[PDB]
Amino acid sequence: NGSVADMRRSIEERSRTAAATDKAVGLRAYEGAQQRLAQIEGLMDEISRTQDQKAIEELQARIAGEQAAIQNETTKLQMIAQLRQAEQALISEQRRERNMRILSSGNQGMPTIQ
Amino acid sequence: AFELFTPLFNKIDQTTATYVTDISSRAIAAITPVVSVGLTLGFITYGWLIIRGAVEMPVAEFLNRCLRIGIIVSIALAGGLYQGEIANAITTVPDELASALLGNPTQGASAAALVDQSAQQGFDRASEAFEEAGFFSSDGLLYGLFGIIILLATGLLAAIGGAFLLLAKIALALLAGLGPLFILALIWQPTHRFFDQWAQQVLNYGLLIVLFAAVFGLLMQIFGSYMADLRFDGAQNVAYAIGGSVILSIVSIVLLMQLPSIASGLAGGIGL
Amino acid sequence: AFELFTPLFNKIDQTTATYVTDISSRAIAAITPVVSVGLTLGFITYGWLIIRGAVEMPVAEFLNRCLRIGIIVSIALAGGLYQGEIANAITTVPDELASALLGNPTQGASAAALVDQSAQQGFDRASEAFEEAGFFSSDGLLYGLFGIIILLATGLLAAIGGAFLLLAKIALALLAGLGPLFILALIWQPTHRFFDQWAQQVLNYGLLIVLFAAVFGLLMQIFGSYMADLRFDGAQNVAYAIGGSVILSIVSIVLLMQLPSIASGLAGGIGL
Amino acid sequence: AFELFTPLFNKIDQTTATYVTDISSRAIAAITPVVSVGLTLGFITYGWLIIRGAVEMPVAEFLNRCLRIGIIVSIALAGGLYQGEIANAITTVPDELASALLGNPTQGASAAALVDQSAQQGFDRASEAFEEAGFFSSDGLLYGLFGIIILLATGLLAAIGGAFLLLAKIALALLAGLGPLFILALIWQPTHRFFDQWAQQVLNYGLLIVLFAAVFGLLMQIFGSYMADLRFDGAQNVAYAIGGSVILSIVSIVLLMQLPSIASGLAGGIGL
């Protein structure tokens, strides 16, 4: 909506912000992944000191839950990638809408000689 | 809608009216009373002096020569009716271009109107081509080239025809404005050639305006109809349509090119 | 199929028939009986007066002058059979262009027909180029440019030739319509120059039409054959083919541009 | 801003001054005293010789011939005021092109200024088209073609008009510089034709500069206003706008092309 110049500024802002958002999400997620590795290493430090059978069975189920959490993060990353692709497609659609609006054959105006 | 020749023609008409027709009307109106009285008093004085002085033949020489001068001056000062003649030229172009050779009658239409309508059909086809180019993001500049070709053909045909019409109108306006100075040239034998030349140019540009209005109206109407039938559907061959467009454009263009030479040649052929 | 010059020629021929030929025929038909009886009665009256008081040379000068006036008026009024002369021009174009210089026998067609066939071959090659451009979404606009160049070459050549044919036909129609007035110019010694000029223009445009019929038919048939052998396969060099197309187009165009000066020069060279 | 015709005109003016006008000024200044004294002493000498020994008509022929020679030499030596006439031409262009036919109040601009402003409007529209082409990475070269068309139309109109203005100015500068040699040509009967031809060419290029100033100013202002209204918003048809641009351009180019022939024809029509 609005003038074609506003459409142009909105589209350029969306493109730049989308690229920056992709980068920032990747960076923060990688930091989280490194902390996840530290946590896994900690769980294996506990495995060395386990004494009874109940303790090691609880630790096995804890590590299984940890694996489930990493699985969930994998699914979330897949979902983020799909959303990234959808956002790029939407930006392209907006570009083409602006292009169609400029070149539409339904336009009736032209400069006036005065 | 597409309106380019109507505003341009109105603008040029206003410039010719304010600067070539009104100024001539202002000058003739200012001198008409004073020159009238002066000529009458000169007639009386010269008659008395020649009957009491230098030899003259009153019955034939004086009356006949005075009649010649009087008729020439009357015609020359009747050019002060410039508005009638400029509007006569303004009416001439559309009346002939509308139905002289078209065969299609309308309640009211000017030459600029018909050129604008035909050019609107052509430019609408070009706009549709541009829209198709917009649809295909890549693999779409072919439609852009099609639109450019259509635009150039329609524009160049319309521009040539309208510009020669403008030349005819401007020239006729300037000649009508400068008329009285050249009708006055009949008074003296050495200056008769000036009237002959002015008359020849008037005939030249009148023949020009008739030929352009008639032939240009016919050709531009044909081109407009052809472009109005042009469609980028799946049933019409694009190459055939664009080729027909360019062929019609170029045919009309060169036919119109021959016409100025024809007008000048007929004007020269008539003795004058 | 590609049909552009046939409808255009038919439209222009209908226009000229309705506006020049039919009006001239109707005007001659309206005056023929009345002028005939008036010319006869005037001859009788002048004969009686010259034998009864006026200055006369009874048998030599009266018979000679009467015969001159009668023969000249008979030819001019006979120009009233305009429909024959218009059909003669419209058939002079195809008979010459069909087989006079082509050599290869053509069963039967018109000038517009052959121009249409050759232009169809060119435009079909352009359409194939556009199709190839459509196949390669990107890296395909090169084929679009190829199609544009083919389309422009074909269109320029066909338009140039057909437009000069149209000019010749229109001019011949107008001259045939205005014929009787200039045949009457023979009667008056001061007005003999009008007949001389009319005859010179008639000869000019007749030579014009002969030259374009012949040469244009030959050149357009050559171009049509060349384009009909063009293919975007893997065995033909695209550059060679497009270059041959543009070379043939430009060669034909410049030759055809030299022809009008030749026609006018020949008409001037014959005294008339 | 767009400033091209102002620097070019100033460059050509400096060149034409420093060579054509300054050489003629200094050469006339160097010979003026010598020729003055020589003519005076020669007049005294020939007077003494004719009154003592030579064939003479004392009071009528000798005094009249001396007067003719003196007036012609004085006029030819008045060419030593070259800067006056060069400034006269360089100011005749702007005064006429400014408000003679435009009808708009003028701050005191020049012809180059108005051409620059209108061409700036056109080139700004082309630059906006290029910007839009930059926005659409692919599917944007259509806007590049639009910009190329706008740029070519504006540039070619401005170039034709400005180049004929330049031709008129250069020709007038050369003629003014060589003026004295042709004003001295009235002294002897055989060399009279040289002055006649020089005067005819002066009239030719003066009429050229008048016509181009007026008409080019009007047309270029109209084109500038039209292009200043052009916008690539969603409300104007791109095809309509570009077509109007090309039509205005071509209409102006051909009208201007008719002008040199008109100027030369008028100069020839005046006897001289």
Side-chain angles (χ1 to χ4, degrees), chain B residues 1-2 4-5 8 11-12 15 19 119 123-124 126-127 130 133-134 136-138 141 144-145 148 151-152 155-156 158-160 162-164 166-167 193-194 197 205, chain D residues 99-103 138-142 145-146 149 218-219 221-222 226 237-240 242-248 250-252 254-255 258 262 269-271:
Chain B
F2 180 83
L4 185 77
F5 276 99
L8 184 59
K11 178 82 167 66
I12 298 300
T15 309
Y19 293 132
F123 292 155
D124 275 346
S127 159
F130 292 152
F136 307 103
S137 178
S138 296
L141 202 54
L145 297 180
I148 300 310
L151 187 138
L152 282 176
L156 189 154
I160 300 299
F164 271 111
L166 263 182
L167 176 62
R193 73 179 185 95
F194 283 120
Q197 286 181 324
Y205 286 114
Chain D
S99 192
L101 275 75
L102 288 184
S138 297
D139 201 1
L141 203 53
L142 188 45
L145 297 181
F146 292 158
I149 289 175
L218 183 63
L219 289 180
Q221 188 274 331
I222 286 167
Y226 179 96
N237 206 356
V238 162
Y240 287 176
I242 304 279
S245 174
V246 300
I247 291 181
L248 279 181
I250 303 169
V251 175
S252 303
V254 285
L255 279 177
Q258 321 306 303
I262 291 176
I270 289 288

Coordinates of all heavy atoms in Angstrom, one line a residue, chain B residues 1-2 4-5 8 11-12 15 19 119-120 123-124 126-127 130 133-134 136-138 141 144-145 148 151-152 155-156 158-160 162-164 166-167 193-194 197 205, chain D residues 99-104 138-142 145-146 149 218-219 221-222 226 237-240 242-248 250-252 254-255 258 262 269-271, unseen atoms left out:
Chain B
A1 N -6.8 8.7 -20.7 CA -6.7 8.5 -22.1 C -5.4 9.1 -22.7 O -4.8 9.9 -22.0 CB -7.9 9.0 -22.9
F2 N -5.1 8.8 -23.9 CA -3.9 9.4 -24.6 C -4.3 10.7 -25.3 O -5.1 10.7 -26.3 CB -3.3 8.4 -25.6 CG -2.1 8.9 -26.3 CD1 -0.9 8.9 -25.7 CD2 -2.2 9.5 -27.6 CE1 0.2 9.3 -26.4 CE2 -1.1 9.9 -28.2 CZ 0.1 9.9 -27.6
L4 N -2.2 13.8 -26.7 CA -1.0 14.5 -27.0 C -1.1 15.5 -28.1 O -0.5 16.6 -28.0 CB 0.1 13.5 -27.3 CG 1.5 14.2 -27.4 CD1 2.1 14.5 -26.1 CD2 2.4 13.2 -28.2
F5 N -1.8 15.2 -29.1 CA -1.9 16.1 -30.3 C -2.9 17.2 -30.1 O -2.7 18.3 -30.6 CB -2.2 15.3 -31.6 CG -1.0 14.7 -32.2 CD1 -0.7 13.4 -32.0 CD2 -0.2 15.5 -33.0 CE1 0.5 12.9 -32.6 CE2 1.0 15.0 -33.5 CZ 1.3 13.7 -33.4
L8 N -1.1 19.8 -27.9 CA 0.0 20.5 -28.6 C -0.6 21.4 -29.7 O -0.1 22.5 -29.9 CB 0.9 19.4 -29.3 CG 2.1 19.9 -30.0 CD1 3.0 20.6 -29.1 CD2 2.8 18.7 -30.6
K11 N -1.9 24.5 -28.0 CA -0.8 25.4 -27.6 C -0.2 26.1 -28.8 O 0.0 27.4 -28.7 CB 0.3 24.5 -26.9 CG 1.5 25.3 -26.5 CD 1.3 26.0 -25.2 CE 2.6 26.5 -24.6 NZ 3.2 27.6 -25.4
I12 N 0.1 25.5 -29.9 CA 0.6 26.1 -31.1 C -0.3 27.1 -31.6 O 0.1 28.2 -32.0 CB 1.1 25.1 -32.1 CG1 2.1 24.1 -31.6 CG2 1.6 25.8 -33.4 CD1 3.4 24.8 -31.1
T15 N -0.1 30.2 -29.6 CA 1.1 31.0 -29.8 C 1.0 31.7 -31.2 O 1.3 32.9 -31.2 CB 2.3 30.0 -29.9 OG1 2.3 29.2 -28.7 CG2 3.7 30.8 -30.0
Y19 N 0.8 35.9 -31.3 CA 2.0 36.5 -31.8 C 2.1 36.7 -33.3 O 3.0 37.3 -33.8 CB 3.2 35.6 -31.4 CG 3.4 35.7 -29.9 CD1 3.6 34.5 -29.2 CD2 3.4 36.9 -29.2 CE1 3.8 34.6 -27.8 CE2 3.6 36.9 -27.9 CZ 3.8 35.8 -27.2 OH 3.9 35.9 -25.8
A119 N -3.0 6.5 -32.1 CA -1.8 6.3 -31.3 C -2.1 5.7 -30.0 O -1.3 4.9 -29.4 CB -1.1 7.6 -31.1
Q120 N -3.3 5.9 -29.4 CA -3.7 5.3 -28.2 C -3.9 3.8 -28.3 O -3.4 3.0 -27.5 CB -5.0 5.9 -27.7
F123 N -0.3 2.4 -28.5 CA 0.4 2.5 -27.3 C -0.2 1.6 -26.2 O 0.5 1.1 -25.3 CB 0.5 3.9 -26.7 CG 1.3 4.8 -27.6 CD1 1.1 6.2 -27.6 CD2 2.4 4.3 -28.3 CE1 1.9 7.0 -28.3 CE2 3.2 5.2 -29.0 CZ 2.9 6.5 -29.0
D124 N -1.5 1.3 -26.4 CA -2.1 0.3 -25.5 C -1.6 -1.1 -25.8 O -1.3 -1.9 -24.9 CB -3.6 0.3 -25.7 CG -4.3 1.3 -24.8 OD1 -3.7 1.8 -23.9 OD2 -5.5 1.6 -25.1
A126 N 1.5 -1.6 -26.9 CA 2.8 -1.6 -26.4 C 2.7 -1.8 -24.8 O 3.6 -2.5 -24.3 CB 3.5 -0.3 -26.7
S127 N 1.8 -1.2 -24.2 CA 1.6 -1.3 -22.7 C 1.3 -2.7 -22.3 O 1.8 -3.2 -21.3 CB 0.5 -0.4 -22.2 OG 0.1 -0.8 -21.0
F130 N 4.5 -4.6 -22.5 CA 5.3 -4.3 -21.3 C 4.8 -5.0 -20.1 O 5.6 -5.5 -19.2 CB 5.3 -2.8 -21.0 CG 6.0 -2.0 -22.0 CD1 5.7 -0.7 -22.3 CD2 7.0 -2.5 -22.8 CE1 6.3 0.1 -23.2 CE2 7.7 -1.8 -23.7 CZ 7.3 -0.5 -23.9
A133 N 5.9 -8.5 -20.3 CA 7.3 -8.5 -19.9 C 7.5 -8.5 -18.4 O 8.3 -9.2 -17.8 CB 8.1 -7.3 -20.5
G134 N 6.6 -7.7 -17.7 CA 6.6 -7.7 -16.3 C 6.3 -9.1 -15.7 O 6.8 -9.5 -14.6
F136 N 6.8 -12.2 -16.9 CA 8.0 -13.1 -17.0 C 9.2 -12.3 -16.5 O 9.7 -11.4 -17.2 CB 8.2 -13.6 -18.4 CG 7.0 -14.3 -19.0 CD1 6.2 -13.6 -19.9 CD2 6.6 -15.5 -18.6 CE1 5.1 -14.2 -20.5 CE2 5.5 -16.2 -19.2 CZ 4.8 -15.5 -20.1
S137 N 9.6 -12.5 -15.3 CA 10.7 -11.7 -14.7 C 11.9 -11.8 -15.6 O 12.3 -10.8 -16.2 CB 11.0 -12.2 -13.3 OG 12.1 -11.5 -12.7
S138 N 12.5 -13.0 -15.6 CA 13.5 -13.3 -16.7 C 12.7 -13.9 -17.8 O 11.5 -14.4 -17.7 CB 14.6 -14.1 -16.2 OG 15.4 -13.5 -15.2
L141 N 12.2 -10.0 -21.3 CA 12.7 -8.8 -22.0 C 12.4 -8.9 -23.5 O 12.4 -7.9 -24.2 CB 14.1 -8.6 -21.8 CG 14.6 -7.1 -22.1 CD1 13.7 -6.1 -21.3 CD2 16.0 -6.9 -21.7
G144 N 9.5 -6.9 -23.8 CA 10.0 -5.5 -23.7 C 10.4 -5.0 -25.1 O 10.1 -3.9 -25.5
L145 N 11.2 -5.8 -25.8 CA 11.6 -5.4 -27.1 C 10.4 -5.3 -28.1 O 10.3 -4.4 -28.9 CB 12.6 -6.4 -27.7 CG 13.9 -6.5 -26.9 CD1 14.8 -7.6 -27.5 CD2 14.6 -5.2 -26.9
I148 N 8.8 -2.0 -27.3 CA 9.6 -0.9 -27.8 C 9.4 -0.8 -29.3 O 9.3 0.3 -29.8 CB 11.1 -1.1 -27.5 CG1 11.3 -1.2 -26.0 CG2 11.9 0.0 -28.1 CD1 10.7 0.0 -25.2
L151 N 5.9 0.7 -29.9 CA 5.9 2.1 -29.4 C 6.6 3.0 -30.5 O 6.1 4.0 -30.8 CB 6.6 2.2 -28.1 CG 6.7 3.5 -27.3 CD1 6.4 3.3 -25.9 CD2 8.0 4.2 -27.5
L152 N 7.8 2.5 -31.0 CA 8.5 3.3 -31.9 C 7.8 3.4 -33.3 O 7.7 4.5 -33.8 CB 9.9 2.7 -32.2 CG 10.9 3.0 -31.1 CD1 12.2 2.3 -31.3 CD2 11.2 4.5 -31.0
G155 N 4.7 5.8 -32.6 CA 5.1 7.1 -32.4 C 5.7 7.8 -33.6 O 5.4 9.0 -33.8
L156 N 6.5 7.1 -34.4 CA 7.2 7.8 -35.5 C 6.2 8.1 -36.6 O 6.2 9.2 -37.1 CB 8.3 6.9 -36.0 CG 9.3 7.5 -37.0 CD1 10.6 6.8 -36.9 CD2 8.8 7.6 -38.5
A158 N 2.9 8.7 -36.1 CA 2.1 9.8 -35.7 C 2.9 11.1 -35.6 O 2.3 12.1 -36.0 CB 1.5 9.5 -34.3
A159 N 4.1 11.0 -35.2 CA 4.9 12.2 -35.1 C 5.2 12.9 -36.5 O 5.0 14.1 -36.7 CB 6.3 11.9 -34.4
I160 N 5.5 12.0 -37.5 CA 5.7 12.6 -38.8 C 4.5 13.3 -39.3 O 4.5 14.4 -39.8 CB 6.2 11.5 -39.8 CG1 7.5 10.8 -39.3 CG2 6.2 12.0 -41.2 CD1 8.6 11.8 -39.3
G162 N 1.7 14.4 -37.8 CA 1.3 15.5 -37.0 C 2.3 16.7 -37.2 O 1.8 17.9 -37.1
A163 N 3.5 16.4 -37.3 CA 4.5 17.5 -37.4 C 4.4 18.2 -38.8 O 4.5 19.4 -38.9 CB 5.9 17.0 -37.3
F164 N 4.1 17.4 -39.8 CA 3.8 18.1 -41.1 C 2.5 18.9 -41.1 O 2.4 20.0 -41.7 CB 3.8 17.1 -42.2 CG 5.2 16.9 -42.8 CD1 5.9 15.8 -42.6 CD2 5.8 18.0 -43.5 CE1 7.2 15.6 -43.2 CE2 7.1 17.8 -44.1 CZ 7.7 16.6 -43.9
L166 N 1.4 20.4 -38.4 CA 1.8 21.6 -37.7 C 2.5 22.6 -38.5 O 2.3 23.8 -38.5 CB 2.6 21.2 -36.5 CG 1.9 21.1 -35.1 CD1 2.9 20.7 -34.0 CD2 1.2 22.3 -34.8
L167 N 3.4 22.1 -39.4 CA 4.2 23.0 -40.3 C 3.2 23.7 -41.2 O 3.3 24.9 -41.4 CB 5.2 22.2 -41.1 CG 5.9 23.0 -42.2 CD1 6.7 24.1 -41.5 CD2 6.8 22.1 -43.0
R193 N 6.2 40.8 -58.2 CA 6.8 39.5 -58.0 C 6.6 39.1 -56.5 O 6.5 37.9 -56.2 CB 8.3 39.5 -58.4 CG 9.2 40.3 -57.4 CD 10.6 40.2 -57.9 NE 11.5 40.8 -56.9 CZ 12.2 40.1 -56.0 NH1 12.0 38.8 -55.9 NH2 13.0 40.8 -55.1
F194 N 6.6 40.0 -55.6 CA 6.4 39.6 -54.2 C 5.0 39.0 -54.0 O 4.9 38.0 -53.3 CB 6.6 40.9 -53.3 CG 8.0 41.2 -53.1 CD1 8.5 42.5 -53.5 CD2 8.9 40.3 -52.5 CE1 9.8 42.8 -53.3 CE2 10.2 40.7 -52.4 CZ 10.7 41.9 -52.7
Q197 N 5.1 35.5 -55.4 CA 5.7 34.5 -54.6 C 4.9 34.2 -53.4 O 4.8 33.0 -53.0 CB 7.1 35.1 -54.2 CG 8.1 35.1 -55.3 CD 9.4 35.6 -54.9 OE1 9.5 36.6 -54.1 NE2 10.5 35.0 -55.4
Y205 N 1.3 25.6 -49.3 CA 1.0 25.1 -48.0 C -0.5 24.7 -47.9 O -0.8 23.8 -47.2 CB 1.3 26.1 -46.9 CG 2.8 26.1 -46.7 CD1 3.6 27.2 -47.0 CD2 3.5 25.0 -46.2 CE1 4.9 27.2 -46.9 CE2 4.8 25.0 -46.1 CZ 5.6 26.1 -46.4 OH 6.9 26.1 -46.2
Chain D
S99 N 11.8 35.1 -24.6 CA 10.3 35.4 -24.4 C 9.6 36.0 -25.6 O 8.5 36.5 -25.5 CB 10.2 36.4 -23.2 OG 8.9 36.5 -22.8
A100 N 10.2 35.9 -26.8 CA 9.6 36.4 -28.0 C 8.3 35.6 -28.3 O 7.3 36.2 -28.6 CB 10.5 36.4 -29.2
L101 N 8.4 34.3 -28.2 CA 7.2 33.4 -28.5 C 6.8 32.6 -27.3 O 5.7 32.0 -27.3 CB 7.5 32.5 -29.7 CG 7.2 33.0 -31.0 CD1 8.3 34.0 -31.5 CD2 7.1 31.9 -32.0
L102 N 7.7 32.4 -26.3 CA 7.3 31.6 -25.1 C 6.2 32.3 -24.3 O 5.3 31.6 -23.8 CB 8.6 31.4 -24.2 CG 9.6 30.4 -24.8 CD1 10.7 30.2 -23.8 CD2 8.9 29.1 -25.1
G103 N 6.2 33.6 -24.2 CA 5.2 34.3 -23.4 C 5.4 34.1 -21.9 O 4.4 34.3 -21.2
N104 N 6.5 33.8 -21.4 CA 6.8 33.6 -20.0 C 7.8 34.7 -19.5 O 8.8 35.0 -20.3 CB 7.3 32.2 -19.7
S138 N 17.1 -8.5 -12.0 CA 16.6 -9.0 -13.2 C 15.1 -8.4 -13.4 O 14.6 -7.9 -12.4 CB 16.6 -10.5 -13.3 OG 17.9 -11.0 -13.2
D139 N 14.6 -8.6 -14.5 CA 13.3 -7.9 -14.9 C 13.4 -6.4 -14.7 O 12.4 -5.7 -14.3 CB 12.1 -8.5 -14.0 CG 10.8 -8.2 -14.7 OD1 10.8 -7.6 -15.8 OD2 9.8 -8.6 -14.1
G140 N 14.6 -5.8 -15.0 CA 14.8 -4.4 -14.8 C 15.4 -3.8 -16.0 O 15.3 -2.5 -16.1
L141 N 15.9 -4.6 -16.9 CA 16.4 -4.0 -18.2 C 15.4 -3.4 -19.0 O 15.7 -2.6 -19.9 CB 17.2 -5.1 -18.9 CG 18.3 -4.5 -19.9 CD1 19.2 -3.5 -19.1 CD2 19.0 -5.6 -20.5
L142 N 14.1 -3.7 -18.8 CA 13.0 -2.9 -19.5 C 13.1 -1.4 -19.1 O 13.0 -0.6 -20.0 CB 11.7 -3.5 -19.1 CG 10.5 -3.0 -19.9 CD1 10.8 -2.9 -21.3 CD2 9.3 -3.9 -19.6
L145 N 15.9 0.1 -21.0 CA 15.5 0.5 -22.4 C 14.7 1.7 -22.4 O 14.8 2.6 -23.3 CB 14.7 -0.7 -23.0 CG 15.5 -2.0 -23.2 CD1 14.7 -3.0 -23.9 CD2 16.8 -1.7 -24.0
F146 N 13.8 1.9 -21.4 CA 13.0 3.1 -21.3 C 13.9 4.3 -21.1 O 13.7 5.4 -21.7 CB 12.1 3.0 -20.1 CG 11.0 2.0 -20.3 CD1 10.3 1.5 -19.2 CD2 10.6 1.6 -21.5 CE1 9.3 0.6 -19.3 CE2 9.6 0.7 -21.7 CZ 8.9 0.2 -20.6
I149 N 15.7 5.2 -24.4 CA 14.8 5.8 -25.3 C 14.6 7.3 -24.9 O 14.7 8.2 -25.7 CB 13.4 5.1 -25.4 CG1 13.6 3.8 -26.1 CG2 12.4 6.0 -26.1 CD1 12.3 3.0 -26.1
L218 N 10.5 27.6 -28.3 CA 9.1 27.2 -28.0 C 9.1 25.6 -27.9 O 8.5 25.1 -26.9 CB 8.2 27.7 -29.1 CG 6.7 27.3 -29.0 CD1 6.2 28.0 -27.7 CD2 5.9 27.8 -30.2
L219 N 9.6 24.9 -28.9 CA 9.5 23.5 -28.9 C 10.3 22.9 -27.7 O 9.8 21.9 -27.1 CB 10.0 22.9 -30.2 CG 9.2 23.2 -31.4 CD1 9.8 22.6 -32.7 CD2 7.8 22.6 -31.2
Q221 N 11.0 24.2 -24.8 CA 10.2 24.5 -23.6 C 9.0 23.5 -23.5 O 8.8 23.0 -22.4 CB 9.8 25.9 -23.6 CG 9.2 26.4 -22.2 CD 7.7 26.1 -22.1 OE1 7.0 26.1 -23.2 NE2 7.2 25.9 -20.9
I222 N 8.3 23.3 -24.6 CA 7.2 22.4 -24.5 C 7.7 21.0 -24.1 O 7.1 20.3 -23.2 CB 6.4 22.3 -25.8 CG1 5.6 23.6 -26.0 CG2 5.5 21.1 -25.9 CD1 5.1 23.8 -27.4
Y226 N 6.7 18.8 -20.7 CA 6.2 17.5 -20.8 C 7.0 16.5 -20.0 O 6.5 15.6 -19.3 CB 6.0 17.1 -22.2 CG 5.5 15.7 -22.4 CD1 4.1 15.5 -22.6 CD2 6.3 14.6 -22.4 CE1 3.6 14.2 -22.8 CE2 5.8 13.3 -22.5 CZ 4.4 13.1 -22.7 OH 3.9 11.9 -22.9
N237 N 0.5 5.7 -17.3 CA 0.9 4.6 -18.3 C 2.2 4.9 -18.8 O 2.5 5.9 -19.4 CB -0.2 4.6 -19.4 CG -0.3 3.2 -20.0 OD1 0.5 2.3 -19.6 ND2 -1.2 3.0 -20.9
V238 N 3.1 3.9 -18.6 CA 4.5 4.1 -19.1 C 4.5 4.2 -20.6 O 5.2 5.0 -21.2 CB 5.4 2.9 -18.6 CG1 6.6 2.8 -19.4 CG2 5.7 3.1 -17.1
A239 N 3.7 3.4 -21.3 CA 3.7 3.4 -22.7 C 3.2 4.8 -23.2 O 3.8 5.3 -24.1 CB 2.8 2.3 -23.3
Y240 N 2.2 5.3 -22.6 CA 1.7 6.6 -23.0 C 2.8 7.7 -22.8 O 3.0 8.5 -23.7 CB 0.4 7.0 -22.2 CG -0.8 6.3 -22.5 CD1 -2.0 6.5 -21.8 CD2 -0.8 5.4 -23.6 CE1 -3.1 5.8 -22.1 CE2 -2.0 4.7 -23.9 CZ -3.1 4.9 -23.1 OH -4.3 4.2 -23.4
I242 N 6.2 7.4 -22.6 CA 7.3 7.3 -23.5 C 6.9 7.6 -24.9 O 7.7 8.2 -25.7 CB 7.9 5.8 -23.4 CG1 8.3 5.5 -21.9 CG2 9.1 5.7 -24.3 CD1 9.6 6.1 -21.5
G243 N 5.7 7.2 -25.3 CA 5.3 7.5 -26.7 C 5.1 9.0 -26.9 O 5.4 9.5 -27.9
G244 N 4.5 9.7 -25.9 CA 4.4 11.1 -26.0 C 5.8 11.8 -26.1 O 6.0 12.7 -26.9
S245 N 6.8 11.2 -25.3 CA 8.1 11.8 -25.4 C 8.7 11.6 -26.8 O 9.2 12.6 -27.4 CB 9.0 11.1 -24.4 OG 10.4 11.5 -24.6
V246 N 8.6 10.4 -27.4 CA 9.2 10.2 -28.7 C 8.4 11.0 -29.8 O 9.0 11.5 -30.7 CB 9.3 8.7 -29.1 CG1 10.1 8.0 -28.0 CG2 7.9 8.1 -29.1
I247 N 7.1 11.1 -29.6 CA 6.3 11.9 -30.6 C 6.7 13.3 -30.6 O 6.9 14.0 -31.6 CB 4.8 11.7 -30.4 CG1 4.4 10.3 -30.7 CG2 4.0 12.6 -31.3 CD1 2.9 10.0 -30.6
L248 N 6.8 13.9 -29.4 CA 7.2 15.3 -29.3 C 8.6 15.5 -29.9 O 8.9 16.4 -30.6 CB 7.2 15.7 -27.8 CG 5.8 16.1 -27.2 CD1 6.0 16.6 -25.8 CD2 5.2 17.2 -28.1
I250 N 10.3 13.7 -32.2 CA 10.4 13.5 -33.7 C 9.6 14.7 -34.3 O 10.1 15.3 -35.3 CB 9.8 12.2 -34.1 CG1 10.6 11.0 -33.5 CG2 9.8 12.1 -35.6 CD1 10.0 9.7 -33.7
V251 N 8.5 15.2 -33.7 CA 7.7 16.3 -34.3 C 8.6 17.5 -34.3 O 8.7 18.2 -35.3 CB 6.5 16.6 -33.4 CG1 5.7 17.8 -33.9 CG2 5.5 15.4 -33.3
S252 N 9.4 17.8 -33.2 CA 10.3 18.9 -33.1 C 11.4 18.7 -34.1 O 11.8 19.7 -34.8 CB 10.8 19.1 -31.7 OG 9.7 19.3 -30.8
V254 N 11.7 17.2 -37.0 CA 11.3 17.4 -38.5 C 10.9 18.8 -38.7 O 11.4 19.4 -39.7 CB 10.3 16.3 -39.0 CG1 11.0 15.0 -39.2 CG2 9.1 16.2 -38.1
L255 N 10.1 19.4 -37.8 CA 9.8 20.8 -38.0 C 11.1 21.6 -38.1 O 11.2 22.5 -38.9 CB 9.0 21.3 -36.8 CG 7.5 21.1 -36.8 CD1 6.8 21.6 -35.6 CD2 6.9 21.7 -38.0
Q258 N 12.9 21.4 -41.4 CA 12.4 22.2 -42.5 C 12.9 23.6 -42.5 O 12.9 24.3 -43.5 CB 10.8 22.2 -42.5 CG 10.2 20.9 -42.1 CD 10.6 19.8 -43.0 OE1 10.5 19.9 -44.2 NE2 11.2 18.8 -42.4
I262 N 13.8 26.8 -45.5 CA 13.0 28.0 -45.5 C 13.8 29.2 -45.5 O 13.6 30.2 -46.2 CB 12.0 28.0 -44.3 CG1 10.9 26.9 -44.6 CG2 11.3 29.3 -44.2 CD1 9.9 26.7 -43.4
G269 N 14.8 34.4 -52.3 CA 13.7 35.1 -52.8 C 13.9 36.6 -52.8 O 13.5 37.3 -53.8
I270 N 14.4 37.1 -51.7 CA 14.9 38.5 -51.8 C 16.0 38.6 -52.8 O 16.9 37.9 -52.8 CB 15.3 39.0 -50.4 CG1 14.1 39.1 -49.4 CG2 16.1 40.3 -50.5 CD1 13.2 40.3 -49.8
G271 N 15.8 39.6 -53.7 CA 16.7 39.7 -54.9 C 18.2 39.7 -54.5 O 18.9 38.8 -54.8

